[PDB]
């Protein structure tokens, strides 16, 4: 069970998303990383397979916007993880493993 219950400000300061698994901190990542993840999965699997990725914004996000993006990334990651093909990919899992190492 993936969740993203919280964001943090880190640093050139940026918003980090604290991805949890079964309520336990797994990894911290920024939007740009999840975007790159999505783009690579799209390259590998061809699109009509992935959920829509929460889109780039042209202005710094308000707190409301951050909260919205957090909720959407949370559902996106859940959806990908629950997909047999996507959720089983080495691209998805190696990303998570490395993000976890860097977080830990």
Swiss-Prot record:
Keywords: Cytoplasm, Cytoplasmic vesicle, Endosome, Lipid-binding, Membrane, Phosphoprotein, Protein transport, Transport
Localization per record: Cytoplasm; Early endosome; Cytoplasmic vesicle membrane
Classification lineage: Eukaryota, Metazoa, Chordata, Craniata, Vertebrata
Function per UniProt: Critical regulator of endosomal recycling of numerous surface proteins, including integrins, signaling receptor and channels. Binds to NPxY sequences in the cytoplasmic tails of target cargos. Associates with retriever and CCC complexes to prevent lysosomal degradation and promote cell surface recycling of numerous cargos such as integrins ITGB1, ITGB5 and their associated alpha subunits. Also required for maintenance of normal cell surface levels of APP and LRP1. Interacts with membranes containing phosphatidylinositol 3-phosphate (PtdIns(3P)).
Gene that this polypeptide is encoded by: SNX17
Signal peptide range in chain numbering: none
Free-text comment about domains: The PX domain mediates specific binding to phosphatidylinositol 3-phosphate (PtdIns(P3)). Required for association with endosomes. The PTB-like F3 module within the FERM-like domain mediates cargo recognition via their NPxY sequences, while the F1 module (Ras-associating) is responsible for interaction with membrane-bound HRAS.
Portion of the full-length sequence here: 2 to 110 of 470
Residues noted as binding a 1,2-diacyl-sn-glycero-3-phospho-(1D-myo-inositol-3-phosphate) in the record, renumbered to the chain: 30, 32, 56, 69
Protein name per its UniProtKB record: Sorting nexin-17
GO biological process: aorta development; cardiac septum development; cholesterol catabolic process; coronary vasculature development; endocytic recycling; endosomal transport; intracellular protein transport; kidney development
Assembly and binders: Monomer. Interacts with APP (via cytoplasmic YXNPXY motif). Interacts with KIF1B. Interacts with the C-termini of P-selectin, PTC, LDLR, VLDLR, LRP1 and LRP8. Interacts with KRIT1 (via N-terminus). Interacts with HRAS. Interacts with ITGB1 and ITGB5 (via NPxY motif). Interacts with CCDC22 and CCDC93; the interaction associates SNX17 with the CCC complex. Interacts (via C-terminus) with VPS26C and VPS35L; the interactions are direct and associate SNX17 with the retriever complex.
Top-level taxon: Eukaryota
One Gene Ontology term of the molecular function aspect: low-density lipoprotein particle receptor binding
GO cellular component term of the entry, any: intracellular membrane-bounded organelle
Family: Belongs to the sorting nexin family.
Residue ranges annotated for the PX domain, each copy included: 1-103
């Amino acid at each position: 069970h993936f969740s993203i219950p919280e964001t943090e400000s880190r640093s050139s300061a940026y918003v980090a998303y604290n991805i949890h698994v079964n309520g336990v901190l797994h990894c911290r990542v920024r939007y740009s990383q999840l975007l790159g993840l999505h783009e690579q999965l799209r390259k590998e699997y061809g699109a009509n397979v992935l959920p829509a990725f929460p889109p780039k914004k042209l202005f710094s996000l308000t707190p409301a916007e951050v909260e919205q993006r957090r909720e959407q990334l949370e559902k996106y990651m859940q959806a990908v993880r629950q997909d047999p093909l996507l959720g089983s990919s080495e691209t998805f899992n190696s990303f998570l493993r490395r993000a976890q190492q860097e977080t830990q």
